[PDB]
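User: I'm writing a short report section on ligand binding and want a predicted complex to refer to. Could you take this sequence and FE2/S2 (inorganic) cluster and write out the structure as tokens? A short remark afterwards would be nice.
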Amino acid sequence: KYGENISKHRSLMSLYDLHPQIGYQSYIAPNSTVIGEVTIGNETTVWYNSVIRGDVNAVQIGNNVSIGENVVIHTAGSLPTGQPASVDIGHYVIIGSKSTIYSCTIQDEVVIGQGCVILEGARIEKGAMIAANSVVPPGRLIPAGTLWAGNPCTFVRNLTKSELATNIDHAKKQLHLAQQHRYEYLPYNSAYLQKSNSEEDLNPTKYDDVTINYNFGDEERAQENPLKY
Amino acid sequence: LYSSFKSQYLLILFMTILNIFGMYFYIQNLRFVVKKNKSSILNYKNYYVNINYSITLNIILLNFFNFFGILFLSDLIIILNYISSYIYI
Amino acid sequence: MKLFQAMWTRTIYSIGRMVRETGLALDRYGCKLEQDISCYEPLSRHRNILPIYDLVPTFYHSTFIAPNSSLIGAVYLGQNTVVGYGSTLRGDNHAIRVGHNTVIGDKVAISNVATLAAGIPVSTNIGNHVNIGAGCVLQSCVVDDNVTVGHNTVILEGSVLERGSVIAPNSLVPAGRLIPSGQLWAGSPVRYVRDLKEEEIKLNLEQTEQNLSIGKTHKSSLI
Amino acid sequence: RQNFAKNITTTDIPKDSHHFAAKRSGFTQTEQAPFAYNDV
Amino acid sequence: MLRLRLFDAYEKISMTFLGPLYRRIGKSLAQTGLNIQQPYTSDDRLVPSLRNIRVTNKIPSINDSEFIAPNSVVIGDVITKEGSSIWYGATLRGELGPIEIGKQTVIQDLVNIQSGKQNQKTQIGDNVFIGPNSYIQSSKINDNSFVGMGSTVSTGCNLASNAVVAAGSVVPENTQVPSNQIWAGSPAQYLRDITPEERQVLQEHHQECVQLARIHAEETEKSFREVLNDFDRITAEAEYDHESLALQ
Amino acid sequence: LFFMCYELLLIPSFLIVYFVSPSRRAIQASLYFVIWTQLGSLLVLIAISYIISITNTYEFNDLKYFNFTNSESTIIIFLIFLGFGFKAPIWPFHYWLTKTHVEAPSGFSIYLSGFLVKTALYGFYKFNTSIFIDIDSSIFIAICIMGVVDSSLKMWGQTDLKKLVAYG
Amino acid sequence: NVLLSNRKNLTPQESVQKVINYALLQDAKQRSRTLRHIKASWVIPALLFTYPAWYLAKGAVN
Amino acid sequence: KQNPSFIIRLNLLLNSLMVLYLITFNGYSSTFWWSHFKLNNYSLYMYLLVIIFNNYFLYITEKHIKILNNYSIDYFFSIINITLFIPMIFLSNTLFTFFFLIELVSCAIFYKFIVSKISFKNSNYKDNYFSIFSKNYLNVLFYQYWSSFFSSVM
Amino acid sequence: KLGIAPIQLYKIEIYKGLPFLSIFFYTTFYFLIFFLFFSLLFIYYLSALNNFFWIILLIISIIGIFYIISIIFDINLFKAFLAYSTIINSISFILLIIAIIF
Amino acid sequence: FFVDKYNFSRRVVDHRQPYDLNFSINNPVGSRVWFKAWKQKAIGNFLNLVGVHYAFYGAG
Amino acid sequence: SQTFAHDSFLGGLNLFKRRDPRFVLDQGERPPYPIINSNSSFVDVLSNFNKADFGLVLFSAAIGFPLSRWVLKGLTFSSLNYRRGLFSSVYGGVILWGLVLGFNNSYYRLNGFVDNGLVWKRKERKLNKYDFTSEFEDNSFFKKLRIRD
Amino acid sequence: HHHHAGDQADRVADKIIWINIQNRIGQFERISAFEGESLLEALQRNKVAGIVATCEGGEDINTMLEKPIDPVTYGPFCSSCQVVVSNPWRNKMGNLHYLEERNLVRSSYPTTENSRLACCILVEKWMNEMIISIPQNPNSVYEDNM
Amino acid sequence: EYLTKKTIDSFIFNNNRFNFINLVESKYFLQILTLILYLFFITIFILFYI
Amino acid sequence: VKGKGSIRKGIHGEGFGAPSHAHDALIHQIKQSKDTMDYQNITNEVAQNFANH
Ligand SMILES: CCCCCCCCCCCCCCCCCC(=O)OC[C@H](COP(=O)(O)OCCN)OC(=O)CCCCCCCCCCCCCCCCC
Ligand code: FES
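Assistant: Sure. The structure tokens for the complex follow:
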């Protein structure tokens, strides 16, 4: 069943009838994986070796957000309060590396540190900050513009208007690094030119009827994202 | 200019009223353009937004002639007067 | 005068990019004309070594880099230094320097912050004979020689770890903090633990050497 | 926000280090880790 | 019919003359353009598969697993039973010590399983669930155990049957977790005893995870020709109408 | 070209008020600015079209060899006075200026009071000097004096400093 | 290379100070290199495209 | 589900060929078909102008149609007929022939309005098992029909 | 036939019920052909009757303006906005025709 | 034929082909198999449309 | 200027050579060339066919192939039979357009609107009062498209 | 809010505002909302049928949801988010804004004296366990089907 | 403020007070008939008595 | 679920609508009882239809 030489991993995978959608100037690292009903806004960065599953429920992610390296984002399926169990992420949201996100709502301009565990039914309000190593208990509300820390997260203090501006500026600074990463890639993948010819590649076992090609009218389409299939 | 050449001041006044009212009618929508965040109004294809290049180039040409069409208006006026000179001959 | 050389280099790079793109486009057109679909293969685009324009990762032949790993930008590696499976070192902003005989675990993510205060290096510096456990996150930190960091530890910007100190697993070093030499510290708000002994230091050094030897054996088996 | 670099190359910033000494020893089980730079 | 004869002639010329010539020219141009911009550029590679890696005499035996993610890394003495699932980005290092995975056991995304000591075995029983971003080293996890996301299980940990460790918990070294007890905290302490509806909730959580693993295994094992067919089908479905769906 | 250069100044000003102002009330203030300034420009345009059509020339010199009757001179002087007084704010038309100064960014407010309004004084002067007008200027003088009196009487009841500077 | 050089003969404070100074110097060198590359990226378009733009404007106007 | 792009392409091609026929045109300024049509410079220039503008609009439509196919082949066949017949409205010489050409083109426009897409595949899953009334199609047809009636009788 | 300002209301409903491409093509067909022929009726085809035409046109123009200077300010639909743009431009061009025939 | 990691003999045949391929009606016009297919098609159209065939063809 | 010789395969190119941008001449204006048959009938134009009209047809046959291919590039959800039939239809349409162009060329030569190998006994003297194109054409390719600049 | 250092986070369950709904088909629904939000946003997040919401709440600068209504606001734009509020809560809502009343009385479907536009409602504490009814709203334009 | 802006604003609002935003069929037919009949009346009145 | 849009399958149940959508009682009766109606039950919808008529 296993033992192939060349990896079969696909960055963007669509479970049947659940297709991901990505906005413009958004960079998903080829090491990362996105499965299912995941919608991602414009100028959004998903860094390397991250998993985003929208299989049992949808995932919606805003525009100017950054997702760190070893981040798992997935949904639950149901909530005790009867609210929708989909993951909702605001517009300028920073998620640090080694963080887990499970069926929660996070409002705009929220910073989550490195090593956090956000559990099901949690509601983080606009402008909130969670320190590096913290766990948000399920079904907990974090007030807007507040700083929290601890494994059972405890209140620290309010955040001044200088801190929120700094967080927004930090969110805005991730665009050009991702743009450089994108510029390192060419629209045409050359990995197929380094493979040998197999028996099945030259002689298919069965043939299918012609239909519309998946890249019909591609010459008139701007190659905005070089990582497109 | 042509109305003034033909000595029709009442027509000029009514066109002025129409022009100012229509100008406000048009520029009223510039207030509605303000949005909290980016709109995300693009179609998706192959998991990614579909940005058309040919329509983009057409808009580029139309934008050039909208911005700087006043410089080349003399040639269009020449051609249109040449066409219109055939009406009676 | 060096601006002239930079201009020439950029022009040459752009011409090469043009030539490569034209060749790939011609090959795709040949695909279509031939009723070929090989160039429609959706293979992985992941690159083990990803150099930004002038920032090219640099390492010795004795270094082990897992094919799962990703070194991006200016990443400098010393001799007999191993990077684990799935680790990411992003030096697109600022360089990442790693000494020799240093082991980096599997899920370690190393990056740098944009700007810091005066007198504080913004890059990441890792000394010699340093062990970093799996699942660690490092940002703009200085780690001296013979320092062990346990698994699932987070070290933030401006942190300094002196020589011979040990960080217990599942810990956090707050930003801009000094951890003195020859001490053990634990906790998320990391707290002081009793000073190290000779036996503990010897065991840590032996474990680091054994991990380096196992990494070398794995590299030899991979080739 | 400002984005300029502060570690300049034209000259060295005038500073002293005797002020704000670090502790580095005699720690308890509850206090925080000492600071790093301390130069003024 | 001359028009059809001309149409047929052109296709053969395009397939046999123009096509190969364009392909050769394009390949040569792509090869020469990559050398120009060295060493300031990189090319697409063939990413190796780390599903089955054998070192010395450590041969993995994972043919009975229901799902192994193509992104996962499995090295050394790793033995899995029937119906097992290893999800995306998971690392299993049996070279440092043998790893045993029981029936219907689910190991979620980005989970590390590696013994700290050189001669320690990590054994995980049947119907066990381990959540994403978890770390496991030299542990004895019994049947029907639950380990939450972002949890650490240390080198001396023995979890009894039906033992629950809450999400974001670090179980200290040399800890025995008794049956039907929920433990939580940065240092793990005995929190509570389980309640039967909580047991039921965990049971359907494990069952839905197993079925999700089955669905993901079905999805991720498609060949190249099936992926192109799926792409074309998705585009067509975007292009279909109500009458087309009714006709289907 | 004189009229075209006078007309060219509107788009950059509106763009600056629209995209650079931090206050939320500046969105409607830009619309007010545009609509009043363009009404004035329309009046000036009518006068310019009158002059161009009657005398098929584009030089200030040629106007020395053509005479305008009393009716045409009166129409032209009224049109240019009202049109240039829309921008250089005469008494009944300064609501746009007050709103725009209150809501606009400080730098553009400096540019608008310091220089932009002066563009109306120049052009008017030119068109005032090139034509022979045989009307009594008492109505225009009264309008200007009413502007002065109305603006200066409103300075006491201002608490916003920027509005006070606008009235000055 | 200060980092690769053996520093066990020094006190930890001296070692960390030496590492910090070396890192700062290398950071300054890298900053200078990146800045000159970006300066070249600015300079090239001016030389390449200033004359065609002026030609376009001159042909349009006079 | 046929993509009508080729149909639009066909239109362009044929329309372009018509341009060619004008470019190489020769003759006298006169009337033809019992003085029912006029051939002079101004009428032919109006004909050429409408052709070239129709061709530009068709080219942009062909570019747009590949982003999302929400139109049928009959839609662009109606467009084909309209673009084939309107310049002959420019070439009219009596009110009689102008009236008949205008009814022909009005019927073509009615045909275009009829073949508008009514139902769409969207993400609204709350409207199953309930009746929602749109009424936009009926209003368009009704008002176009009665305006055409009044204009024609007068 | 043209849905001009006195009788412009049904054009709003027609635009409301139509797709954007239909409005595209309808606008080009309306301005290029219908309105141009309507103009050439007074300018070229029936110029001998201008001594009867002008006054009629004048009246209509006035009515149209006084009918739409307030109605165009209580709309809340994109299609209605486009249709009223076309209507306003039609009124302006009719005033230009009145100027031309003098 | 690998040339600097690039294979110049890369070839993957397309499995998406028309069902209509290799049909008798797609043979060159005038062939015996094409004539057989055309004869079968013409008779089928006449049987369904007798009056239409009569009108159009006889009138022409 | 010099025009392509008639009754030759390149005669149709004379359709692209003009003296003025006018579509048609005035009611009483003389055609540039002597008239062979002013009130021609359908068979009069057909009998006037020669190598130039056949060259127009041949050019239509040559250029129809890329145009038909370009049209065919827009097909989806099609079979081989439908594709071949549509290609044949488009090609036949282009052939018909070429035949129409040849018929018009023959009619023009009959009427004397284009070069038919005859010259008027008396040349119509014209004074080039307004001249914006003579030197521009003489320093360009457009001297080929103009007759008597 | 009001918190002290070391305090634990409150529960989302205790902050839920409950809305009771009678559907277009005569069935009963229970919906969770939060303070500071509009009724339209809660209804659309909970996927409640019967509302069309053609204009999607109106403009973004001078909205009807700000506690003092700004004079130069434009008001609602489509009047297709109508709900019927029961007597106590509707009485506490107060008199309608003149623009909202103009849009309400101008709709193509019949309305009531308790009719109220959803995007013009800001959810408050006193709206807990409020009873509303949503008969089907009219369609306006061609794009409503798309 | 009032005499320059709000006069026009209130005029537009009060005029729109008497306008149906949605066209009904009877109003459409009545508008067409009224236009015909009273354009004819005003033209004949200008011709005869003016 | 294959060929069912966003409809999800839970434990003991296939599911009949998209997540967070209201369950319809009439369709429940249709699915459970194919053609069996013990009595003409007067629900709110039936009374509303009567009032509308
Ligand atoms: C490298 C260099 C080597 C040397 C140079 C070599 C050059 C070789 C290629 C050039 C010569 C090729 C042959 C000639 C060009 C092809 C034909 C062509 O473009 O014709 C333009 C057309 C001709 O019409 P005209 O001649 O007036 O017809 C009347 C009687 N013959 O004219 C017209 O249609 C008349 C104008 C129509 C109306 C225009 C004005 C109104 C519209 C203005 C705005 C348009 C906006 C877009 C509209 C839609 C169209 C895109
Ligand atoms: S959603 Fe349009 S008025 Fe409320």
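A remark for your report: Helices of chain A lie at 161-172, 174-183, 199-202. Chain A touches chain J at residues 190, 192-197, 201-204, 206-211 (CB under 8 Å).
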